[PDB]
Amino acid sequence: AALKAGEVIGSALPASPGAAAGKVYFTADEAKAAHEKGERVILVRLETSPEDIEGMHAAEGILTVRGGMTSHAAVVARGMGTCCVSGCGEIKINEEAKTFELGGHTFAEGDYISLDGSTGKIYKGDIE
């Protein structure tokens, strides 16, 4: 089902083999609330850091504009087996909130998306 014609937006580099479905968010604080309300959260950042770990767990998924073949982002992910992406096309961030424009769609920090980690293919809407 799907994954054969999903309206996928783009595909960055496969940081760590992972699969997740969470709502976009650019803060470890929002994860604390989410993690306590429903979890399933994602994290977008122009740079990854260790201490953010707590934010990493709650964020079983991470789509950043930076990162690379290997770095704190991946290294930490490979250790936490968490799904994470790094270095995408030209994700333009929109302050309207905290979005990122990629492929042919604008993902705003205010929706639900499903990103893959095993080849590096992002998708939106919880598959089923």
Quick one: CA dihedral 43, 44, 45, 48, positive or negative? positive
| Boundaries of domain holding 7 | 1-128
Catalytic residue, chosen from 35, 57, 72, 105, is 72
Q: What is the DSSP letter of 51?
A: T
Closest CA to 85 of 97, 102, 98: 102
SS3 68: coil
Task: Give the position of tokens 């803060």.
Answer: 27
State which amino acid sits at residue 105: H
Q: What determination technique applies here? A: NMR
Considering its fold, how many domains does the chain have in total? 1
Three-class DSSP category at 98 = coil
For position 21, which CATH number holds? 3.50.30.10
Structure tokens of 64? 């950043």
> For this structure, is 105 an active site residue?
no
Q: How many helices (H) and strands (E) does the chain have?
A: 3, 9
Handedness of CA 72, 75, 78, 83 (dihedral sign): positive
Q: Quote the tokens at residue 88.
A: 């995408």
